[PDB]
Amino acid sequence: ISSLWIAKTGLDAQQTNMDVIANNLANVSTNGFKRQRAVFEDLLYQTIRQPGAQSSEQTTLPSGLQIGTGVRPVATERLHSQGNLSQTNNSKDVAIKGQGFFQVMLPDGTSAYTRDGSFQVDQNGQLVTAGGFQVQPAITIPANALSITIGRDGVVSVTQQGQAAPVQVGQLNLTTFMNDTGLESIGENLYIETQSSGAPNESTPGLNGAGLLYQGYVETSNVNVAEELVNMIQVQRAYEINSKAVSTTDQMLQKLTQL
Amino acid sequence: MISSLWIAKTGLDAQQTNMDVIANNLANVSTNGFKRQRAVFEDLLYQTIRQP
Amino acid sequence: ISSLWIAKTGLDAQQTNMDVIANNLANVSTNGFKRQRAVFEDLLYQTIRQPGPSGLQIGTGVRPVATERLHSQGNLSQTNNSKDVAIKGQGFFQVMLPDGTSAYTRDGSFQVDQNGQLVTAGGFQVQPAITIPANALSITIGRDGVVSVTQQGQAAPVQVGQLNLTTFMNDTGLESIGENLYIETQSSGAPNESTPGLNGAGLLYQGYVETSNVNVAEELVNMIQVQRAYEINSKAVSTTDQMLQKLTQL
Amino acid sequence: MISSLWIAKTGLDAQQTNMDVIANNLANVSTNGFKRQRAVFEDLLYQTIRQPGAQSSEQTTLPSGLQIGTGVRPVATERLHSQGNLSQTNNSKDVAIKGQGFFQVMLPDGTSAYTRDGSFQVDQNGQLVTAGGFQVQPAITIPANALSITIGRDGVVSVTQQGQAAPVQVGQLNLTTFMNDTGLESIGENLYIETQSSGAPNESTPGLNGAGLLYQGYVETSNVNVAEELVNMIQVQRAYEINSKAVSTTDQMLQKLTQL
Amino acid sequence: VMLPDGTSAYTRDGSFQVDQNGQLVTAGGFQVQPAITIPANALSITIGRDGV
Amino acid sequence: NGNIQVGPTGQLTIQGHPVIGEGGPITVPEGSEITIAADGTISALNPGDP
């Protein structure tokens, strides 16, 4: 019967809503995470009487008979707002303030883009991210380093013992996209470009609408904890209501069959 | 046995590991030549219903 | 004599649907299980010509034509074990049956036999034959198939084997046997083996195990629907029996 | 009769076994040197009505045949052989073991068992025995006039006297290593015995050939994560309820067919 | 759908699979006449609102 | 009468009489499982064979 096939879609929509809520609440402490919200959509409609049909020679129907089919989760989106900064007092932690993504060379040869800035140096001195992947501009740090300085410009400078001025080792460019909401979000806290996302535009920080870089800070996730509790209350109550609808349809059919 | 349950389980495990490293740092606060620890998390795989 | 067999086919179809629903609900915790859905289609139509547009086609029952597995991606559960492996994307581990043939699996839960090889829970050994040595201080499986074991007194870990995985151009056609194993058929394409992360192969996560893609709410709604359909379809048999008895009374 | 009834019965039995494993893990949460265990499931055979890949017609094949399931069964259980947390008891005759290995004890009937619970006493004869009376295989014998007992990281046990300053060596507390620790057969009182799955045990001194060290005065705690156990309890309860509902639905439809 | 006899039969049920060549077929082996070919090593298959 | 039967020597036969196709009556492998296509093709699978 139709009502069962409608309430089933309702239940599935509520389940997906609960899933995205739980995913947002799970990695509340993941640095550089963007909250996700789901947008639903009603399904097709069955038109029994066509609205606007000639009801007589003069009058016409004001609104015909249409019956809904259910709801369908059309999409989900990520809010690219600015999360709060947290201080870690680590010389190699970079927080991006504004817009942009660090470019990373994946082992296969492709390129990914990420926002979580927390870097180390491998045995060869190259600057890599937590996970082994290396930053694309290939910032190399000598073995005789005393400190690492990353100014808001994006230029990485290193000091050596018995020297007057530090020696620049490279520039830490960053890429911005026309539409960062369209980036395909692979695991390991990485995004890759798609057709919906524009072609990457690489630039130095602080120019052409790019963000700035702060050294020693990490960008926290922009997950609003208070909103999740009320969202959970709403999701649970909606699920209970749809369950009651299914129960009513079942009772109706059970009465019908034993006729 | 629903996806939300497993997601919440992973979140609980992550918070437990965070508390573990916090307690470890607090325990040996008076140990000579000791360096603190900080855990870094990443999100797991994403399953795509409609391709972006 | 007329609607009895049509209603019998309907009852049988609903029974088969209930069977697949119950089978899906049974292994809600089996690792790497893929849910199945059955599809039906009506049988041949008989036609009665008009004397001398024509029409008047009287149908008959329905039969189940196929059942398909939704080869989707399941959620990952954490076990902390150092030998459990989970697939990220598409691909099957290749295992060898003791007979000599080859099977393929999604369930990553590996152990080590007395000889140091890598086997699945049941004794079947992974075909590339990873041979973990003794005194293995720790074993790590990365994104690729490289399995590295660290040994005491050794700075650089020694690579002990490569864990390739196979992919098919049609995985829905794989024949299913017990203990989470698949055997290639004619419908399924010839297997192609590749390193993880290349040519459409997935990645390998260490310490995680793939869950099953079973939606309990969908199963409950289908259960209500199939029970009501069966209960209604019994009425056709009841009414046909009553009218046939009334006919034969005179 | 109806296959779905037996399928749901198998599901209920699997959930019952899972709950039994969870309850066993929770019961001995305070047992020293206990390893949590996880059950692994698998599905039974499949009834194939139409053979996949068969010729649907000329120059065409069936994309996927008709196969119906039969149920599930638990295939095996695996113990997570990882390192537990150490807790201090200040007692000088308790040793925890760091890394891999098992202490070897001699069962009274003459066989040998391998344990990991380190908390020993001294019998009336002066031998070092486990909590339960089984004597440790290397046969450590402590003399009478003992002030303090020192068990080093490398497994050499010595005892101090009153007169002479230098402590006297008493024995070596070497430990055994296996190819497959998970394959050991488990019995009561925290004991494991060698099976065919686990390779032949090889003894070694602690700290060599990948064998762990000894910490005197500490006991290894069970590696049970209660937070996981509670969520697993919720999961198994819900799955049991779902399977019971399936049984009820099958009974209802069978009754309706009967009333015909 | 292209029948084995060579004639064309028209259907409404949407449930499609792929055979050993990647050709799009119905559940039963019959091929869709436009003969959409899905290559191997394909990450995802999308069927948009139109017939693309 | 579509109730096809197979004898001990792989002889396809409806009740009493053998079934014929191209040429004489058709014979199949000794104990292979038989699948009937939608156009009359007979697929034979020897048991145990992949």
PDB file of N, CA, C and O in Angstrom, chain A residues 54-105:
ATOM      1  N   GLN A  54     -10.437  22.587 -17.385  1.00  0.00           N
ATOM      2  CA  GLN A  54     -11.725  23.247 -17.565  1.00  0.00           C
ATOM      3  C   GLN A  54     -12.782  22.472 -16.790  1.00  0.00           C
ATOM      4  O   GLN A  54     -13.174  21.375 -17.196  1.00  0.00           O
ATOM      5  N   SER A  55     -13.231  23.031 -15.665  1.00  0.00           N
ATOM      6  CA  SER A  55     -14.283  22.382 -14.892  1.00  0.00           C
ATOM      7  C   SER A  55     -15.625  22.440 -15.605  1.00  0.00           C
ATOM      8  O   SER A  55     -16.454  21.541 -15.436  1.00  0.00           O
ATOM      9  N   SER A  56     -15.858  23.488 -16.384  1.00  0.00           N
ATOM     10  CA  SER A  56     -17.061  23.619 -17.190  1.00  0.00           C
ATOM     11  C   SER A  56     -16.700  24.443 -18.419  1.00  0.00           C
ATOM     12  O   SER A  56     -15.520  24.598 -18.750  1.00  0.00           O
ATOM     13  N   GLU A  57     -17.714  24.968 -19.103  1.00  0.00           N
ATOM     14  CA  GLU A  57     -17.444  25.827 -20.249  1.00  0.00           C
ATOM     15  C   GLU A  57     -16.745  27.113 -19.828  1.00  0.00           C
ATOM     16  O   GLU A  57     -15.974  27.681 -20.608  1.00  0.00           O
ATOM     17  N   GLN A  58     -16.988  27.578 -18.602  1.00  0.00           N
ATOM     18  CA  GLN A  58     -16.391  28.808 -18.099  1.00  0.00           C
ATOM     19  C   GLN A  58     -15.447  28.563 -16.929  1.00  0.00           C
ATOM     20  O   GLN A  58     -14.285  28.974 -16.976  1.00  0.00           O
ATOM     21  N   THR A  59     -15.914  27.901 -15.874  1.00  0.00           N
ATOM     22  CA  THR A  59     -15.111  27.757 -14.672  1.00  0.00           C
ATOM     23  C   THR A  59     -14.061  26.662 -14.840  1.00  0.00           C
ATOM     24  O   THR A  59     -14.202  25.736 -15.643  1.00  0.00           O
ATOM     25  N   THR A  60     -12.993  26.778 -14.052  1.00  0.00           N
ATOM     26  CA  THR A  60     -11.897  25.823 -14.059  1.00  0.00           C
ATOM     27  C   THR A  60     -11.586  25.431 -12.624  1.00  0.00           C
ATOM     28  O   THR A  60     -11.914  26.153 -11.680  1.00  0.00           O
ATOM     29  N   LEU A  61     -10.949  24.281 -12.467  1.00  0.00           N
ATOM     30  CA  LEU A  61     -10.626  23.789 -11.134  1.00  0.00           C
ATOM     31  C   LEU A  61      -9.646  24.734 -10.450  1.00  0.00           C
ATOM     32  O   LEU A  61      -8.665  25.156 -11.071  1.00  0.00           O
ATOM     33  N   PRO A  62      -9.874  25.092  -9.186  1.00  0.00           N
ATOM     34  CA  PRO A  62      -8.895  25.941  -8.497  1.00  0.00           C
ATOM     35  C   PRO A  62      -7.618  25.201  -8.150  1.00  0.00           C
ATOM     36  O   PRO A  62      -6.525  25.760  -8.294  1.00  0.00           O
ATOM     37  N   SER A  63      -7.723  23.952  -7.702  1.00  0.00           N
ATOM     38  CA  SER A  63      -6.547  23.160  -7.358  1.00  0.00           C
ATOM     39  C   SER A  63      -6.915  21.694  -7.483  1.00  0.00           C
ATOM     40  O   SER A  63      -7.790  21.213  -6.759  1.00  0.00           O
ATOM     41  N   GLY A  64      -6.247  20.987  -8.381  1.00  0.00           N
ATOM     42  CA  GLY A  64      -6.581  19.603  -8.626  1.00  0.00           C
ATOM     43  C   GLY A  64      -6.141  18.694  -7.497  1.00  0.00           C
ATOM     44  O   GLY A  64      -5.643  19.120  -6.455  1.00  0.00           O
ATOM     45  N   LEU A  65      -6.340  17.401  -7.717  1.00  0.00           N
ATOM     46  CA  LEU A  65      -5.977  16.385  -6.742  1.00  0.00           C
ATOM     47  C   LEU A  65      -4.571  15.882  -7.039  1.00  0.00           C
ATOM     48  O   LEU A  65      -4.313  15.345  -8.122  1.00  0.00           O
ATOM     49  N   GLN A  66      -3.667  16.061  -6.082  1.00  0.00           N
ATOM     50  CA  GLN A  66      -2.318  15.528  -6.173  1.00  0.00           C
ATOM     51  C   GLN A  66      -1.982  14.806  -4.882  1.00  0.00           C
ATOM     52  O   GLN A  66      -2.383  15.239  -3.799  1.00  0.00           O
ATOM     53  N   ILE A  67      -1.243  13.711  -5.002  1.00  0.00           N
ATOM     54  CA  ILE A  67      -0.862  12.890  -3.862  1.00  0.00           C
ATOM     55  C   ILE A  67       0.654  12.787  -3.831  1.00  0.00           C
ATOM     56  O   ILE A  67       1.285  12.518  -4.860  1.00  0.00           O
ATOM     57  N   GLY A  68       1.235  13.012  -2.659  1.00  0.00           N
ATOM     58  CA  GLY A  68       2.672  12.927  -2.525  1.00  0.00           C
ATOM     59  C   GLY A  68       3.166  11.495  -2.519  1.00  0.00           C
ATOM     60  O   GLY A  68       2.403  10.538  -2.399  1.00  0.00           O
ATOM     61  N   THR A  69       4.484  11.352  -2.659  1.00  0.00           N
ATOM     62  CA  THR A  69       5.118  10.043  -2.667  1.00  0.00           C
ATOM     63  C   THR A  69       6.101   9.835  -1.526  1.00  0.00           C
ATOM     64  O   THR A  69       6.350   8.685  -1.154  1.00  0.00           O
ATOM     65  N   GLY A  70       6.652  10.897  -0.966  1.00  0.00           N
ATOM     66  CA  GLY A  70       7.575  10.779   0.139  1.00  0.00           C
ATOM     67  C   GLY A  70       8.617  11.875   0.073  1.00  0.00           C
ATOM     68  O   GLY A  70       8.414  12.901  -0.565  1.00  0.00           O
ATOM     69  N   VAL A  71       9.740  11.625   0.745  1.00  0.00           N
ATOM     70  CA  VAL A  71      10.838  12.577   0.818  1.00  0.00           C
ATOM     71  C   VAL A  71      12.119  11.860   0.419  1.00  0.00           C
ATOM     72  O   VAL A  71      12.253  10.645   0.566  1.00  0.00           O
ATOM     73  N   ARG A  72      13.066  12.635  -0.110  1.00  0.00           N
ATOM     74  CA  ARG A  72      14.313  12.097  -0.601  1.00  0.00           C
ATOM     75  C   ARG A  72      15.421  13.062  -0.210  1.00  0.00           C
ATOM     76  O   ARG A  72      15.317  14.257  -0.525  1.00  0.00           O
ATOM     77  N   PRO A  73      16.475  12.599   0.456  1.00  0.00           N
ATOM     78  CA  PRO A  73      17.564  13.515   0.814  1.00  0.00           C
ATOM     79  C   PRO A  73      18.348  13.942  -0.413  1.00  0.00           C
ATOM     80  O   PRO A  73      19.131  13.161  -0.957  1.00  0.00           O
ATOM     81  N   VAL A  74      18.142  15.181  -0.859  1.00  0.00           N
ATOM     82  CA  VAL A  74      18.703  15.594  -2.140  1.00  0.00           C
ATOM     83  C   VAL A  74      20.214  15.746  -2.054  1.00  0.00           C
ATOM     84  O   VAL A  74      20.932  15.352  -2.979  1.00  0.00           O
ATOM     85  N   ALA A  75      20.735  16.300  -0.961  1.00  0.00           N
ATOM     86  CA  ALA A  75      22.174  16.531  -0.913  1.00  0.00           C
ATOM     87  C   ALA A  75      22.622  16.757   0.521  1.00  0.00           C
ATOM     88  O   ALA A  75      21.828  16.723   1.461  1.00  0.00           O
ATOM     89  N   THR A  76      23.923  16.985   0.668  1.00  0.00           N
ATOM     90  CA  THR A  76      24.509  17.423   1.922  1.00  0.00           C
ATOM     91  C   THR A  76      25.601  18.433   1.607  1.00  0.00           C
ATOM     92  O   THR A  76      26.231  18.377   0.548  1.00  0.00           O
ATOM     93  N   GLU A  77      25.814  19.366   2.528  1.00  0.00           N
ATOM     94  CA  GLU A  77      26.744  20.458   2.299  1.00  0.00           C
ATOM     95  C   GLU A  77      27.618  20.647   3.528  1.00  0.00           C
ATOM     96  O   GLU A  77      27.254  20.271   4.643  1.00  0.00           O
ATOM     97  N   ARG A  78      28.789  21.234   3.303  1.00  0.00           N
ATOM     98  CA  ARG A  78      29.753  21.504   4.357  1.00  0.00           C
ATOM     99  C   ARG A  78      29.892  23.007   4.526  1.00  0.00           C
ATOM    100  O   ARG A  78      30.093  23.730   3.546  1.00  0.00           O
ATOM    101  N   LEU A  79      29.777  23.471   5.765  1.00  0.00           N
ATOM    102  CA  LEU A  79      29.866  24.895   6.073  1.00  0.00           C
ATOM    103  C   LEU A  79      31.335  25.277   6.186  1.00  0.00           C
ATOM    104  O   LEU A  79      32.022  24.882   7.128  1.00  0.00           O
ATOM    105  N   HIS A  80      31.823  26.053   5.218  1.00  0.00           N
ATOM    106  CA  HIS A  80      33.216  26.498   5.209  1.00  0.00           C
ATOM    107  C   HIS A  80      33.370  27.822   5.959  1.00  0.00           C
ATOM    108  O   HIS A  80      33.795  28.840   5.417  1.00  0.00           O
ATOM    109  N   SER A  81      33.013  27.790   7.238  1.00  0.00           N
ATOM    110  CA  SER A  81      33.210  28.936   8.108  1.00  0.00           C
ATOM    111  C   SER A  81      34.623  28.882   8.684  1.00  0.00           C
ATOM    112  O   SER A  81      35.447  28.055   8.287  1.00  0.00           O
ATOM    113  N   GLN A  82      34.918  29.763   9.630  1.00  0.00           N
ATOM    114  CA  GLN A  82      36.229  29.831  10.258  1.00  0.00           C
ATOM    115  C   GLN A  82      36.118  29.321  11.686  1.00  0.00           C
ATOM    116  O   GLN A  82      35.430  29.926  12.513  1.00  0.00           O
ATOM    117  N   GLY A  83      36.794  28.214  11.971  1.00  0.00           N
ATOM    118  CA  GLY A  83      36.808  27.696  13.318  1.00  0.00           C
ATOM    119  C   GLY A  83      37.789  28.433  14.205  1.00  0.00           C
ATOM    120  O   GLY A  83      38.712  29.096  13.742  1.00  0.00           O
ATOM    121  N   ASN A  84      37.578  28.305  15.510  1.00  0.00           N
ATOM    122  CA  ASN A  84      38.442  28.974  16.468  1.00  0.00           C
ATOM    123  C   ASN A  84      39.847  28.387  16.422  1.00  0.00           C
ATOM    124  O   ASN A  84      40.049  27.228  16.057  1.00  0.00           O
ATOM    125  N   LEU A  85      40.821  29.209  16.790  1.00  0.00           N
ATOM    126  CA  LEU A  85      42.214  28.799  16.855  1.00  0.00           C
ATOM    127  C   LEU A  85      42.554  28.354  18.270  1.00  0.00           C
ATOM    128  O   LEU A  85      42.047  28.912  19.246  1.00  0.00           O
ATOM    129  N   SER A  86      43.404  27.338  18.374  1.00  0.00           N
ATOM    130  CA  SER A  86      43.895  26.858  19.656  1.00  0.00           C
ATOM    131  C   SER A  86      45.413  26.854  19.635  1.00  0.00           C
ATOM    132  O   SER A  86      46.027  26.435  18.650  1.00  0.00           O
ATOM    133  N   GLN A  87      46.014  27.318  20.724  1.00  0.00           N
ATOM    134  CA  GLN A  87      47.459  27.466  20.805  1.00  0.00           C
ATOM    135  C   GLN A  87      48.101  26.180  21.305  1.00  0.00           C
ATOM    136  O   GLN A  87      47.634  25.573  22.273  1.00  0.00           O
ATOM    137  N   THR A  88      49.179  25.768  20.636  1.00  0.00           N
ATOM    138  CA  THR A  88      49.880  24.545  20.987  1.00  0.00           C
ATOM    139  C   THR A  88      51.353  24.744  21.305  1.00  0.00           C
ATOM    140  O   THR A  88      51.988  23.803  21.794  1.00  0.00           O
ATOM    141  N   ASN A  89      51.913  25.924  21.038  1.00  0.00           N
ATOM    142  CA  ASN A  89      53.316  26.226  21.325  1.00  0.00           C
ATOM    143  C   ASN A  89      54.265  25.279  20.598  1.00  0.00           C
ATOM    144  O   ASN A  89      55.366  25.002  21.075  1.00  0.00           O
ATOM    145  N   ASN A  90      53.850  24.773  19.442  1.00  0.00           N
ATOM    146  CA  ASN A  90      54.681  23.906  18.619  1.00  0.00           C
ATOM    147  C   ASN A  90      55.136  24.686  17.397  1.00  0.00           C
ATOM    148  O   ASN A  90      54.326  25.347  16.740  1.00  0.00           O
ATOM    149  N   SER A  91      56.433  24.614  17.099  1.00  0.00           N
ATOM    150  CA  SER A  91      57.000  25.456  16.054  1.00  0.00           C
ATOM    151  C   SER A  91      56.522  25.076  14.660  1.00  0.00           C
ATOM    152  O   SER A  91      56.580  25.913  13.755  1.00  0.00           O
ATOM    153  N   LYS A  92      56.051  23.847  14.460  1.00  0.00           N
ATOM    154  CA  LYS A  92      55.691  23.372  13.133  1.00  0.00           C
ATOM    155  C   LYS A  92      54.186  23.305  12.904  1.00  0.00           C
ATOM    156  O   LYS A  92      53.752  22.760  11.887  1.00  0.00           O
ATOM    157  N   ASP A  93      53.382  23.847  13.813  1.00  0.00           N
ATOM    158  CA  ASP A  93      51.934  23.871  13.656  1.00  0.00           C
ATOM    159  C   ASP A  93      51.514  25.174  12.995  1.00  0.00           C
ATOM    160  O   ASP A  93      51.872  26.258  13.466  1.00  0.00           O
ATOM    161  N   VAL A  94      50.750  25.067  11.913  1.00  0.00           N
ATOM    162  CA  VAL A  94      50.299  26.220  11.145  1.00  0.00           C
ATOM    163  C   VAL A  94      48.781  26.206  11.100  1.00  0.00           C
ATOM    164  O   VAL A  94      48.173  25.166  10.820  1.00  0.00           O
ATOM    165  N   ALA A  95      48.174  27.354  11.377  1.00  0.00           N
ATOM    166  CA  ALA A  95      46.734  27.535  11.274  1.00  0.00           C
ATOM    167  C   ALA A  95      46.466  28.569  10.196  1.00  0.00           C
ATOM    168  O   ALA A  95      47.075  29.644  10.196  1.00  0.00           O
ATOM    169  N   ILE A  96      45.571  28.243   9.276  1.00  0.00           N
ATOM    170  CA  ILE A  96      45.238  29.156   8.191  1.00  0.00           C
ATOM    171  C   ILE A  96      44.016  29.971   8.587  1.00  0.00           C
ATOM    172  O   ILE A  96      42.988  29.419   8.994  1.00  0.00           O
ATOM    173  N   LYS A  97      44.130  31.286   8.481  1.00  0.00           N
ATOM    174  CA  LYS A  97      43.087  32.221   8.882  1.00  0.00           C
ATOM    175  C   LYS A  97      42.548  32.880   7.620  1.00  0.00           C
ATOM    176  O   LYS A  97      43.190  33.764   7.048  1.00  0.00           O
ATOM    177  N   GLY A  98      41.368  32.449   7.190  1.00  0.00           N
ATOM    178  CA  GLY A  98      40.782  32.965   5.971  1.00  0.00           C
ATOM    179  C   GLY A  98      40.293  31.864   5.056  1.00  0.00           C
ATOM    180  O   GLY A  98      39.452  31.052   5.450  1.00  0.00           O
ATOM    181  N   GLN A  99      40.811  31.822   3.833  1.00  0.00           N
ATOM    182  CA  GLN A  99      40.417  30.820   2.857  1.00  0.00           C
ATOM    183  C   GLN A  99      41.651  30.235   2.190  1.00  0.00           C
ATOM    184  O   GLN A  99      42.688  30.894   2.079  1.00  0.00           O
ATOM    185  N   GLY A 100      41.526  28.990   1.742  1.00  0.00           N
ATOM    186  CA  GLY A 100      42.620  28.317   1.072  1.00  0.00           C
ATOM    187  C   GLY A 100      42.878  26.922   1.595  1.00  0.00           C
ATOM    188  O   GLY A 100      42.379  26.550   2.659  1.00  0.00           O
ATOM    189  N   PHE A 101      43.653  26.136   0.852  1.00  0.00           N
ATOM    190  CA  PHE A 101      44.004  24.786   1.257  1.00  0.00           C
ATOM    191  C   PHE A 101      45.451  24.505   0.882  1.00  0.00           C
ATOM    192  O   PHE A 101      45.900  24.851  -0.213  1.00  0.00           O
ATOM    193  N   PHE A 102      46.177  23.875   1.801  1.00  0.00           N
ATOM    194  CA  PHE A 102      47.505  23.375   1.482  1.00  0.00           C
ATOM    195  C   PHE A 102      47.408  22.224   0.491  1.00  0.00           C
ATOM    196  O   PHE A 102      46.554  21.340   0.611  1.00  0.00           O
ATOM    197  N   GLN A 103      48.308  22.229  -0.484  1.00  0.00           N
ATOM    198  CA  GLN A 103      48.354  21.201  -1.513  1.00  0.00           C
ATOM    199  C   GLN A 103      49.319  20.107  -1.086  1.00  0.00           C
ATOM    200  O   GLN A 103      50.408  20.397  -0.581  1.00  0.00           O
ATOM    201  N   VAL A 104      48.919  18.856  -1.287  1.00  0.00           N
ATOM    202  CA  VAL A 104      49.674  17.692  -0.843  1.00  0.00           C
ATOM    203  C   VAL A 104      49.837  16.749  -2.026  1.00  0.00           C
ATOM    204  O   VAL A 104      48.900  16.566  -2.809  1.00  0.00           O
ATOM    205  N   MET A 105      51.023  16.164  -2.164  1.00  0.00           N
ATOM    206  CA  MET A 105      51.290  15.177  -3.205  1.00  0.00           C
ATOM    207  C   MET A 105      50.990  13.788  -2.656  1.00  0.00           C
ATOM    208  O   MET A 105      51.681  13.305  -1.755  1.00  0.00           O
TER     209      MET A 105
END
